[PDB]
Every structure is written in C-alpha cells, then in structure tokens.
Amino acid sequence: LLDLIWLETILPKTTSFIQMKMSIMVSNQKGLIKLYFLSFLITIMISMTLFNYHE
Amino acid sequence: ARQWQPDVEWAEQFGGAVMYPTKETAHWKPPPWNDVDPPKDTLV
Amino acid sequence: AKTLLHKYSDIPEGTECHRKAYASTSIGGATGLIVSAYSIALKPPASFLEGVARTGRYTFTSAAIGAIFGLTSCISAQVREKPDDPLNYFIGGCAGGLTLGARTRSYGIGAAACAYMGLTAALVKMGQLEGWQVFAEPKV
Amino acid sequence: KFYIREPPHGSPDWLKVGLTLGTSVFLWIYLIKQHKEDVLEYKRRNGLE
Amino acid sequence: MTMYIAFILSTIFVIGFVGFSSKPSPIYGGLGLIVSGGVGCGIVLNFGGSFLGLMVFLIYLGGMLVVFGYTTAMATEMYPEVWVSNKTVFGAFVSGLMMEFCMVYYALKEEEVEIIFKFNGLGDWVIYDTGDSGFFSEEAMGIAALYSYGTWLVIVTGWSLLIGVVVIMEITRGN
Amino acid sequence: MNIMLTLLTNVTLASLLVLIAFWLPQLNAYSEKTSPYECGFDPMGSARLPFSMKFFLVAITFLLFDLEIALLLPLPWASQTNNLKTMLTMALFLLILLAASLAYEWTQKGLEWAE
Amino acid sequence: MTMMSGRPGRVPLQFLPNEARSLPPPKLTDPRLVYMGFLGYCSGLIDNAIRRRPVVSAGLHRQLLYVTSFVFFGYYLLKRQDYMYALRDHDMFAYVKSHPEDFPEKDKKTYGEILEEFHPVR
Amino acid sequence: MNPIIYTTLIMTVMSGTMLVMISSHWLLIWIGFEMNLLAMIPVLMKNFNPRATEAATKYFLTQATASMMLMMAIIINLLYSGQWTITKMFNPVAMTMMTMALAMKLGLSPFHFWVPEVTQGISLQAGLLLLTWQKLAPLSVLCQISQSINPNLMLTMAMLSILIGGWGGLNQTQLRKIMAYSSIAHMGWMTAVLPYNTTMTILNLLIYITMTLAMFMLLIHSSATTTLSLSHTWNKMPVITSLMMVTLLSMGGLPPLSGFMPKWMIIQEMTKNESIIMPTLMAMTALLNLYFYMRLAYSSSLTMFPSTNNMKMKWQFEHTKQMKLLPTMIVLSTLVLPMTPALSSLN
Amino acid sequence: MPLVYMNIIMAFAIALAGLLMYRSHLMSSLLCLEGMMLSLFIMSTLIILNTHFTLANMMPIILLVFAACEAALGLSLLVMVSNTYGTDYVQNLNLLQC
Numbered sequence A: 001l002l003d004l005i006w007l008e009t010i011l012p013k014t015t016s017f018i019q020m021k022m023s024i025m026v027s028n029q030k031g032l033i034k035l036y037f038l039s040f041l042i043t044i045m046i047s048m049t050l051f052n053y054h055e
Numbered sequence B: 001a002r003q004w005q006p007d008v009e010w011a012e013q014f015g016g017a018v019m020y021p022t023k024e025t026a027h028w029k030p031p032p033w034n035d036v037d038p039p040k041d042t043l044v
Numbered sequence C: 001a002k003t004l005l006h007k008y009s010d011i012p013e014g015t016e017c018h019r020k021a022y023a024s025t026s027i028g029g030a031t032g033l034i035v036s037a038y039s040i041a042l043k044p045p046a047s048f049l050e051g052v053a054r055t056g057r058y059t060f061t062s063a064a065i066g067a068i069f070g071l072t073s074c075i076s077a078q079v080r081e082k083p084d085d086p087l088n089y090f091i092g093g094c095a096g097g098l099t100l101g102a103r104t105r106s107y108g109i110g111a112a113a114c115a116y117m118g119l120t121a122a123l124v125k126m127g128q129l130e131g132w133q134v135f136a137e138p139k140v
Numbered sequence D: 001k002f003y004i005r006e007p008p009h010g011s012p013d014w015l016k017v018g019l020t021l022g023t024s025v026f027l028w029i030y031l032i033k034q035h036k037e038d039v040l041e042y043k044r045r046n047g048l049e
Numbered sequence E: 001m002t003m004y005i006a007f008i009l010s011t012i013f014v015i016g017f018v019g020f021s022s023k024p025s026p027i028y029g030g031l032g033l034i035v036s037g038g039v040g041c042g043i044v045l046n047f048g049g050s051f052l053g054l055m056v057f058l059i060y061l062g063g064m065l066v067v068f069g070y071t072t073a074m075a076t077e078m079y080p081e082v083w084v085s086n087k088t089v090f091g092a093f094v095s096g097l098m099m100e101f102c103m104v105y106y107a108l109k110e111e112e113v114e115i116i117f118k119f120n121g122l123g124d125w126v127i128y129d130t131g132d133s134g135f136f137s138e139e140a141m142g143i144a145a146l147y148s149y150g151t152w153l154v155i156v157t158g159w160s161l162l163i164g165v166v167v168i169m170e171i172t173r174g175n
Numbered sequence F: 001m002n003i004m005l006t007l008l009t010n011v012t013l014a015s016l017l018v019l020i021a022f023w024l025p026q027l028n029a030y031s032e033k034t035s036p037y038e039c040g041f042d043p044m045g046s047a048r049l050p051f052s053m054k055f056f057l058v059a060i061t062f063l064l065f066d067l068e069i070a071l072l073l074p075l076p077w078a079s080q081t082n083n084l085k086t087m088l089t090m091a092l093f094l095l096i097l098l099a100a101s102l103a104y105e106w107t108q109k110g111l112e113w114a115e
Numbered sequence G: 001m002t003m004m005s006g007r008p009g010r011v012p013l014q015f016l017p018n019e020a021r022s023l024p025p026p027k028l029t030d031p032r033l034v035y036m037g038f039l040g041y042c043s044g045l046i047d048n049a050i051r052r053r054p055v056v057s058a059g060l061h062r063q064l065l066y067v068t069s070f071v072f073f074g075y076y077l078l079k080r081q082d083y084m085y086a087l088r089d090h091d092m093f094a095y096v097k098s099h100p101e102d103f104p105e106k107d108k109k110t111y112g113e114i115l116e117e118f119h120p121v122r
Numbered sequence H: 001m002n003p004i005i006y007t008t009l010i011m012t013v014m015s016g017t018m019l020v021m022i023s024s025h026w027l028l029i030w031i032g033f034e035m036n037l038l039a040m041i042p043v044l045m046k047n048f049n050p051r052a053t054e055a056a057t058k059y060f061l062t063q064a065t066a067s068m069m070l071m072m073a074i075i076i077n078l079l080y081s082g083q084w085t086i087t088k089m090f091n092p093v094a095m096t097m098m099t100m101a102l103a104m105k106l107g108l109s110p111f112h113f114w115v116p117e118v119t120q121g122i123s124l125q126a127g128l129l130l131l132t133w134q135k136l137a138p139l140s141v142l143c144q145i146s147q148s149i150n151p152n153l154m155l156t157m158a159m160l161s162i163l164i165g166g167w168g169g170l171n172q173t174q175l176r177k178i179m180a181y182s183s184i185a186h187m188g189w190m191t192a193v194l195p196y197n198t199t200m201t202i203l204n205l206l207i208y209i210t211m212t213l214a215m216f217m218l219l220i221h222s223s224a225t226t227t228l229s230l231s232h233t234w235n236k237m238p239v240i241t242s243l244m245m246v247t248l249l250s251m252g253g254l255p256p257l258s259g260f261m262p263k264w265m266i267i268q269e270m271t272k273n274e275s276i277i278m279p280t281l282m283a284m285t286a287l288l289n290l291y292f293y294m295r296l297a298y299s300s301s302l303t304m305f306p307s308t309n310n311m312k313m314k315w316q317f318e319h320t321k322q323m324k325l326l327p328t329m330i331v332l333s334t335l336v337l338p339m340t341p342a343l344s345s346l347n
Numbered sequence I: 001m002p003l004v005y006m007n008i009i010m011a012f013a014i015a016l017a018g019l020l021m022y023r024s025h026l027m028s029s030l031l032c033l034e035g036m037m038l039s040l041f042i043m044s045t046l047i048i049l050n051t052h053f054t055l056a057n058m059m060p061i062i063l064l065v066f067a068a069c070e071a072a073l074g075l076s077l078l079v080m081v082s083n084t085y086g087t088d089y090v091q092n093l094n095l096l097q098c
C-alpha cells in the first residue's frame, strides 16, 4: 500500500504523468503556419497591452 | 546466463513518428528514409 | 494588466469580501479569455458556435475558480481574525482546486488541484509578506 | 598485403611531418622568448631588478 | 484645418491597405496596393519629397505588374474572390473600415493615447518649418549624397543585389 | 492643386464618355450575344485556369533590375559634388555589378524561356 | 548589464593592453598551463581514436602539435584573465578610496561586550 | 549547387552577421540582417526536396515578419528621438517591438514553432549552421540594448522557452527536432541572464555552440537522423557512441562536465540580484532536457540494440572525409570546468 | 503627433495583421509583406522630411532596394511551392510538424 503504490503515486508517477501530458500538448502542432501566425498575433497584442502599457 | 539487451519489440517503441502516441498522432507517419517525399500526381 | 492585480491588492485582506471576490473573478476571467484565445488559434474548433462554446467554458471555469478563491480566502481571513497568514491563501487555493475538479468532473484532478493551488497560493502569500521577487530588477 | 593504393605507404609523408614538427618547435621557441621578455618588462616596470 | 487634403490622402492610404489586407484574389489586392502607392506618393509630395514619392510609385508599379503575371500563373482559381463574394473577406474589410473610423473619431473629437501617444489634430500644416533659402532641393541633395557620403551603403547594396540575382538563380534551379 | 484639377478633368471626361456610350444607343442584350468569344465555338475550359509563365525567372530578375533604376536616377545631381573621383568610382562600380549580374544570368541560361 | 566594456581609455580589439605588461607573467609550470596541455593531449588521443589509429602511438608529431597549440593559446588566455582581474580590483579599490562616506570605518566591539542570544540544544 | 557559389553564399551569410556586429547605425544592422537572410535561404535548399522547400518558406516568412517589426521599431525610435545609433531605445513601445522582433528571429517562445520544423526539413549541415551561426547577430543586438530591455517580458519569454524546450523535446524520436528543442531551451537560458550580465550570456553562447557543433559533427559522422538509425552505430563505431554519450551528459548540465558551467554561472549571477525563484525553476525545468538526453544515451551507447546483416559490409570501409575540429570540439564540450575563471577574459 | 502619422502606423498595423492572419493563397501574404514595406517607406520619409535630416533622404531608397530582394526571394519560393503542388496554398506546407 505504501512503498509499491502510494509513495510511487505521489512523487515520481505524478511527475512522469504530468510531464508526459504537457509534452503531448506542447508537441502536437500540425505544422500549419496559419495557426502559428495567429498565435503570433495574439502574443504581439498581449505584449503590447500587458507589458508595454506598464512602464 | 547473460545480460539482457534490447530486442526488436523493445526497439520498435522508438520507431514511431513521436513518443507517446495519441489517437490524433497515431496517424502521423515517420519521414522517408531519405528526406524525399514521393511526387504528387497534380497534373497541370 | 497589473491594474487588475492592483485593484485586487489595494483592498485589505480580510475586508470587503464581495469586492475581493469580484476582483479575483475579473482576474480569473481574463486568464481564461487568454487561454481560450490561444487554444482557438492553435486548435481551431471547426465551427464558430463550437469556438464560442469553448471560450465560454474556459472563461467560466477560470472566473469561477477566481471567485471561489477570493471569497474563501477573504472569509477565512476575517473569521479567524488572522490577516497576513498564508493558510488563508492555502484554503482559498485548495477550494479553487476543488472547484476546478468539480468543473472538469474528476476526483483525482480535484484533489491534485486542491493541493497544488493551495500550496501555490500559500507560497504567493509568503512572497508578499517577505518581499520575494519573481522578476528581480538588475541591482548589481 | 593490401590490394590497392593505400595512400599512406611504408614511408610517411615527410613534408607534412616536417611542417608539423617545425610548427611545434617555432611555437615553443616563440613562447619561451615571449615569457623571457614578459618577465624582463615586468621587472623593469615594477623595479624588482 | 487646411482643406485636410493630406488627411484624406492618408485615409485613402489606410483604405487601400485594408483592401489588400482582407486578402481577396491577388488581382484586387494588387490593385489596392497600387492605389495605396499612388496616394502615398501624393502624401510624400505634399511634404516636399517629389523624388521619393515618384520613385516609390514607379517601383510599386513594376512590382505589381510582376505580381499580376505571377498571379495569373500560380494564384488563380475558378472563381476569384472580390470583397463582397466572401463572408470572411467582407467581414475583414468592414472591420478594418470601422476600426479606422473609430480611431479617426476618437483622435479628432477628443485627445487620447491610442497605443503610443496622443493627438489633437490641428492639421499637418502646423509642424512645418518655414525656411526660406536655396537654389536647390534639399531632398535631391540628400539623395545625391549617396555617391559621396554613402560609399559603404553603395557597396553593401550592390553586393546584395548581385547576390540576389545569384540566389534567385539557385532557388528556382530544382533538380 | 492644378494637377489635381487636371486629373479630375481627365477622369470626368472619360467617365462621361463611358456614360454616353452606355446610355445613348439601343441595347438588345441576350445570352448568345454576351457569351465568351473563341472564334466559333464554346470554350472547352475556363479562362481563369492557371496560365503557365515561361519567362518567370526574367520576371523576378526584372524586380531586382528595376531597383537598380532607383539607385542611378540621382546621378545628375551626384555629378555636382566636389569629390567627383569618389562618386565616379561608386557610379561605375554600381553599373559594373549590374553588368556582372546580367552576365551571370546570361551564362547560366537564366534568360532562356522554360520549354 | 555590461560592466567593463565602456571603461574609459579602452582600445577596442587589443586582447592585451600595454598596461597589462606591468603584471607578473604566469610561470610556464603554471598548473593551468599544465591542464591546457593535458586538454591538448586528450584532443590528440581522441583524434587517434576517431580515425581508428593506435591511440597512444600513432601520431607523435600530431599529438605534439595538439599539446603545443593548447599551451600556446592558454598562456595568452591566462595573461588576459589575470589582467582583467587586476583591473577589477584596481577599480574597486579606487572607488572605495574616492567614496569614503559610502564605506565608513566603524569602531568594532569585542565579543565580551556584544550580547549574543544563546539557544540551548535539548 | 556549384562549390564556388556555395562558398560565396556562406561568406555572404557570415558577412551579414559581421555587418550586424560591427555597425553603430540601425540601418546597417537591418541591412546585415537582410543580407544574412537572403544568403541563408539557398543554403537551406541545397539538397532539393519538398521538405527543404517547405522549411525554407517557413523560415523566410518568419524572418521577414521579424525584419518588418525590427524596422518599425527603428523608425519609431527615430521618430521619438532623431537617433540612428544603437545605444538604448528611447521609446518603450519601440523597445517592446524590437524585443519581440529579436525573439522571433532567435526562436524564443512563443515564437519557437518554426525552429523544430525547419530543423527537421533541412540537412544536418544546414541544421548545424542554423542552430549555431544564426544566433550570433540577434544576441549581439540584444547585448547592445540590454539596459533598455524590460526585464518582465524578457524573463517571461526565457522561462517559456526553457519549459517548452523541455516539454517538446520529451516527445521526439527524430534527432533534428531534439536538437531544435534543446536549442530553444538553451536560448531561454541565455536570454534569462541578459538584463543582469551580458558576459554570462556570451559564455553560455560559446559553451552551447561548442556542444552543438560537437553533436552535429558526431551525427554527420554517423549519418543518423533518427533514434533507431543511431542505435546501429555501436555495431560499426563504438567510440563515436561513447563520445556522443559523454557529450549528451555534458549537454544535460551534469557536473564535472562543461555544460554545468554556464547554468552554474547564471544562477549564481541571478542570486546577486535577489532572484531565487526563477533560477530554482530554471534548473528544475532543465531536468527535462537532461531526461531526454539520457533516453537518447540509453538507446545509443549504454545498451546494444539489434543490428542488420548488411552492416557487415560497412565493417570493411573507413570514413572518407575527416573532421579536423571534432576532437577539439569534444574536449572543449566536456573538460573545461577547471578553467572557469577564464570567463573574466570575456568582459 | 498628427493624424497622418497615426494613419501610416495604422496602415502598418493592418498590413501586419493581414500577414499574420492567413488565408489560402501565399501570394496574398506576400502582398501584405510588400504593403508593410510601403508603409515603412512612407513613415520614414515623412519623419526625415519633417526634421530636415538631409543625409537620410537616401535611406528610404535603400529600404526600397531590400524590399525588392525580399519580394524576389518570396516569389522564387512561391514558384517552387507551386511546382510541387499546382497551387500556392499554405495548407500544402504541412510535411513538417512540431
């Protein structure tokens, strides 16, 4: 219950699962430049509003 | 008695287009052995 | 904008719980709107109505988390008469994590979020109290 | 033994070997002379000897 | 204030930019860029830069001719799109027109900092210099100084143009 | 101001000519009359289909050569500088590289139309 | 963020100013030079290994050139590094001397007259 | 491509970078960037195929957009101060636009999307050039305007680059995409310390370039672009796989290897500015890069994968072309930690 | 600043948005890029004329020159893309993923 299951569950297995899910989310881009450049426009607007308005 | 070494079943885990295949990414194919895709029959 | 952060932080800890909850709701809604914008850009929804539905889902989830966190933290601060105590932020963050788990309808996500958001909020409270700097200025 | 050209034969390329050894010797002599001059200039500037 | 001719020309500049940025068929986008180039030439001429405006107009006329040929070769379809044949194109066009109208209104009726700084209006004529001298054009002198002051610029520009010829030769080689 | 009036006058005259052309005569328009012309017969395909360009490389080269025109038109004013030796060297240098780029494209079969 | 590039009187690309000649040059048995020569020797051994040559015996002239090049570069590298550290300390001392009000010399108390809190371990 | 034309194009790329790094005028820096891009496009397409053409098109679109933004920032700065000298931007809006343009040129998150694809679409030599030489000019410009940068935006982009590099590299079986995600993470590390100390940025750049050159040369030597192709190298050249494993350990930052020296120097520097949370997060996130390096080392050198029969024929032939600087590159990529104080020569 | 400066800056912003928001044709994006170059030319020319900085009267021309290079470069790439697919659609450039 403790060594083989829950101590595994909390520290190492949770870390592995979270990193794998984040890796899948980050790397699954279809390679279409339309989506990338739309995200670029969103980023440029955000940087102009949230950092450039605060100085 | 000999040390375990990877076999074909172990090696095929690294032969896909990605690690951790999902339902969306399972249809992704690995690139051609040379970096050359077959020509498309897009007759003009 | 950090103007919303100031609007939240200008009100003292255990006072005006409704206004604290409103400010935190605004911050959460802004975060959810940004998340939905990036999600729609990078993963198109194949329909306009489905994109509107996804934006509403994300923004409502984030705004609900913000409201729950702010209201719970302010109420815990005023009832216990202990402002500047990170455990109020821990309770608020863990309630927000439970709200996220309820919204996604997942017990495991609920527990993990409750713990992680509570710890993060308590850490933010400690950083506020001790003056920890995330984006340190170049002093030297 | 071998069947074909095998560009390195029993005699090594003596021009390349001579150039390599000459470069090493020139660098070593230059470094020794430079260190001697550095020591002399440092002593002259700081008035040690 | 002064007949706002330059303001009209800049508004038409923005309108042509919206015309080609809503991205209809490249035939109409090329036409919109030609209109923008002409009105930009007019804007620059109203500020004393005759040579610069005329040259940018000439350059963009040549570029749009090459673009027209390339569009006929490689960017055509069965039914080329105009600004009213597509909901997306019409929406982008109308949105650009309306947000231009909003900026113009909010800038001329009151004084606000849109993104960088503020504006009150007063027309362009205020910021002029009223200098009175010369048997030459300062713009022409500054441009002709490229052959006496700008030796380094001439060197890098000529090298880049020669390399550009070589580069376009390499890219379209195929094999 | 006078040039704007001139442009307005010319455009107005042409527009009124078009109006007269379209509103004076009797119009009897029918589908057979308005159909596309290809000398006796209905066109097989669309006229909006891709039309291949065999001089595409020369068209790209024209873009770079057209900006060489931008760099050489200030030459009449450049001849009035005091240090004529420098400007003549730079004016000649700029024409030499243009000649070399034309020579490079000519020798590498760049001026030949695609078969 | 750029500390010493704009130091006055600095020649752009010297690598070794004239004033650096006032410093004692590193000894030829400097342990840092010996480590640089060791790096050159390791490079020569790896060059033999990659080319499928007898690792220790194949190129004695080539190994010697590796060691000599590494030592030669390391000498001037050490000279420049020592000069830069000497400049740092020179500027630090001059600045402390020129700003006495920012680095005051305060009277120091003895331990018999400083009250330190005692924390028992039990 | 003709070898003379190839040499001319390479020297034009280098000349554009040198023009960027020796100019005091903003227009000449812009011209250097344009010249670099113009000569760089054909180098990516040297081996003609649809993938190379797609990579070149994506690269050109990204860099041309970045160049437009950069010229816009220059013009805004000139408008608010009649200055052409690259000292310190006088307008904060112009500074934000310039920072975004330089981040897009470098490939920092969230403008990292193009870096893997392009790196996958070109050859290994083109990837080597793209991931080593193409970083010099934007980083030099950033170093020159370091005092003007807003720390919040730059640090946000750096942290995002480290996180995204680790997460994206976790998912890759292709070696070029692994190198690209590694590059993104290292760029984040470089730009994190830029507002505090540009010498640390230069040191990190040099170390990363050395290790990247070592890895690309080792991958060209054992002509492998996938994990499974690299798993055959032990049965033909075991020394190559051993050297690759040591270099991979160095890239992960493990002491006493060289790759540890940059991070060690950066974290320490950040602690001089009362920055603890960001260095802690940065190291804990670089653990992901270490993980996928370790996975590659497992598949390549620490175990032995099955081979093929035809490999026997390859046993009878040597490598025709020899890399002169590969041994020096490996030694510099691994054994230079004891010479850490020499970094003082970089300021 | 006058309304004309903000009009030119708005033109640049519109062209940048047009470039960043893609449709099918690559030629439309190339036109947006050329429009950004045109707006930069106009803005820099207006500033240089207004401040009477004589020696930068040459920099917009040089600007134009490199604009041409980009245009030529882009058109070259477009040709190759077309020769692969028969269209200039940006959808076809999806062989490479992240």
Ligand SMILES: CCCCCCCCCCCCCCCCCC(=O)OC[C@H](COP(=O)([O-])OCC(O)COP(=O)([O-])OC[C@@H](COC(=O)CCCCCCCCCCCCCCCCC)OC(=O)CCCCCCCCCCCCCCCCC)OC(=O)CCCCCCCCCCCCCCCCC
Binding pocket: A038, A042, A044, A045, A048, C029, C033, C034, C036, C037, C038, C040, C041, C044, C045, C046, C047, C048, C049, C050, C051, C052, C055, E018, E021, E022, E023, E088, E091, E092, E093, E095, E096, E099, I013, I014, I016, I017, I018, I021, I022, I023, I024
């Ligand atoms: C100096 C630096 C600054 C530079 C920037 C300055 C820019 C100034 C000029 C702006 C004027 C524009 C003029 C021409 C632009 C050309 C556009 C174009 O060509 O479109 C091509 C593009 C592709 O064309 P296509 O491939 O032929 O057609 C494919 C179909 O459309 C789609 O086929 P499907 O059925 O397969 O797809 C389903 C459907 C799906 O559609 C959707 O899912 C979108 C619906 C989302 C609902 C949003 C929630 C509603 C409430 C939010 C309000 C926020 C406050 C609320 C607070 C709490 C409320 C209680 O469509 C999509 O997937 C498209 C997704 C993209 C949507 C718009 C992209 C913006 C960022 C993404 C976030 C979207 C909003 C999320 C919420 C964030 C906050 C608003 O067309 C579109 O994507 C849609 C039409 C676009 C027309 C409007 C463009 C104007 C917006 C420009 C920027 C906005 C302002 C900028 C800054 C303002 C402040 C400073």
Ligand SMILES: CCCCCCCCCCCCCCCCCC(=O)OC[C@H](COP(=O)([O-])OCC(O)COP(=O)([O-])OC[C@@H](COC(=O)CCCCCCCCCCCCCCCCC)OC(=O)CCCCCCCCCCCCCCCCC)OC(=O)CCCCCCCCCCCCCCCCC
Binding pocket: A002, A006, A007, A010, C105, C106, C107, C108, C109, C111, C114, C115
């Ligand atoms: C290093 C050395 C060793 C240490 C390390 C090793 C040990 C550490 C880890 C050990 C295990 C801890 C794991 C935490 C919970 C994990 C849940 C999970 O895995 O979800 C996935 C898993 C997947 O679910 P799903 O896929 O979404 O749907 C299928 C379900 O199976 C379908 O489910 P269902 O339809 O059958 O029914 C589900 C439903 C109903 O569940 C049931 O059907 C059965 C009833 C279960 C509730 C039992 C309550 C009655 C007994 C508890 C007595 C009071 C607590 C002890 C007080 C001691 C007094 C001296 O659940 C609920 O409604 C419960 C909601 C909340 C009630 C319980 C929460 C109380 C929190 C504890 C507060 C403690 C404060 C500090 C006290 C200090 C003074 C001593 O969810 C579950 O199935 C588990 C549900 C039960 C959750 C509550 C159990 C937690 C017990 C206490 C946790 C506190 C420990 C951690 C403290 C640190 C946190 C900040």
Ligand SMILES: CCCCCCCCCCCCCCCCC[C@@H](O)O[C@H](CO[C@H](O)CCCCCCCCCCCCCCC)COP(=O)(O)OCC[N+](C)(C)C
Binding pocket: E148, E149, E151, E152, E155, E159, F083, F085, F086, F089, F090, F093, F097
């Ligand atoms: C150090 C390494 C040397 C070799 C490698 C050099 C690499 C770069 C290529 C050439 C470098 C050019 C640097 C010189 C800059 C020119 C400016 C300076 O030298 O003075 C000019 C001298 O100009 C001369 O004409 C020299 C220019 C001749 C060079 C043209 C051909 C050589 C270039 C070849 C390489 C370029 C790429 C390949 C082209 C085919 C003008 O002086 P002047 O007008 O009196 O007075 C100016 C002050 N006023 C205006 C106030 C009066």
Ligand SMILES: CCCCCCCCCCCCCCCCC[C@@H](O)O[C@H](CO[C@H](O)CCCCCCCCCCCCCCC)COP(=O)(O)OCC[N+](C)(C)C
Binding pocket: F013, F016, F017, F019, F020, F023, F024, F025, F026, F027
């Ligand atoms: C060289 C360039 C400059 C020349 C200077 C003169 C410029 C002339 C402008 C060009 C137009 C002249 C064309 C000549 C024919 C007139 C065409 C049209 O205007 O007349 C009819 C206009 O009629 C309208 O259709 C309906 C009549 C009334 C419509 C209401 C308008 C308001 C009038 C209210 C009347 C109250 C009194 C007004 C006078 C004080 C159209 O009839 P329609 O059959 O279609 O078209 C064929 C014309 N055909 C028959 C000659 C072949």
Ligand SMILES: CCCCCCCCCCCCCCCCC[C@@H](O)O[C@H](CO[C@H](O)CCCCCCCCCCCCCCC)COP(=O)(O)OCC[N+](C)(C)C
Binding pocket: G005, G011, G012, G013, G014, G015, G077, H203, H206, H207, H210, H258, H332, H333, H336, H339, H340, H341, H342, H343, H345, H346, H347
């Ligand atoms: C992996 C370890 C790093 C390896 C790096 C590559 C090694 C080969 C480099 C070849 C050495 C020759 C370069 C310089 C020779 C003469 C040029 C000299 O004059 O340049 C000076 C500059 O000197 C050079 O920077 C010295 C280079 C020495 C680099 C060694 C530091 C390595 C860190 C510690 C690791 C130990 C490395 C071991 C060596 C093998 C000019 O200074 P300055 O123009 O004002 O600075 C410009 C930048 N500023 C103004 C913004 C600051």
